[PDB]
Assembly symmetry: C3
Homo-oligomer: 114 residues x 3
């Protein structure tokens, strides 16, 4: 089986440094929790809310050693009324035998409300 591992985090300001810092924080955390090896990752999608503009979240993946070849692309999150502003979400697809109800999905910064 291959399974999806969700993640979410919010930034405080829209800067390159802030967006890449908190996105790398999110991914390190997912990796730790689920013991993900780069070569077991089919691909990753990262979305940002429409208020974030300074840099693509995906550039943070290349800060991780050994993740040079994991295919990643970003998309835009839909603008929802009463949604969490300045949120970065991730969908990581990994090869794994762990049950679905046991995957550790990581919700950080203001996204702890999830």
């Amino acid at each position: 089986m291959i399974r999806g591992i969700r993640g979410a985090t919010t930034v405080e300001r829209d800067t390159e440094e802030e967006i890449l810092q908190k996105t790398k924080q999110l991914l390190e955390k997912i990796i730790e929790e689920n013991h993900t090896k780069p070569e077991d990752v089919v691909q990753m999608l990262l979305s940002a809310t429409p208020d974030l503009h300074a840099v693509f979240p995906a550039k943070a993946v290349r800060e991780l050693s050994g993740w040079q070849y994991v295919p990643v692309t970003c998309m835009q999150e839909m603008d929802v009324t009463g949604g969490l502003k300045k949120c970065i979400r991730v969908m990581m697809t990994v090869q794994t035998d762990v049950p679905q109800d046991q995957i550790r999905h990581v919700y950080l910064e203001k996204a702890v409300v999830l």
Copy 2:
């Protein structure tokens, strides 16, 4: 193999009530037709065209008993001149044996226009 299943629907009003009703309806036809079990779903993506703002469509997934563990995320459909308006599309990635050409993709409401060759 793993194979993605596609579905699409539309709503007449941007409101929480209609979006969650129509997305629930769509997911249920796909699960039925494809005999999908929650535990075979790798993940699910939902998109909406940029005219829908009341609720994330994804919130309907939890009303489907046993689906509360399926990974979901929403994204924006691109704004194309003449594309179908207030349309929610789904890409469900599943582990199945059923061959590509027998995967039953589901279009409902005004979305019956989008791919008539899969009907």
Copy 3:
């Protein structure tokens, strides 16, 4: 394993003709480079930057014979200040035994600047 394949290309103008020809040409190259046969494709996602509105790039998949049943959907790339303009990107997910570091990702047109190593 199943692995994702990334591609990217740019159009000169927002036209239905140039979007469909440059998307076709990218997909043809990914297929060529990775030996992709349609029944091995789990699904495919195409994004375009918020400056392309003429047609949905997924319509280009219709000109590849044998690909009628590949599940495709599109999404909007996020709008990053100073990002590469008029860009179409694909994330093709395929059944494959090729190693992750040997998958041929394809970057064409002005998109060649995006990942000079892939």
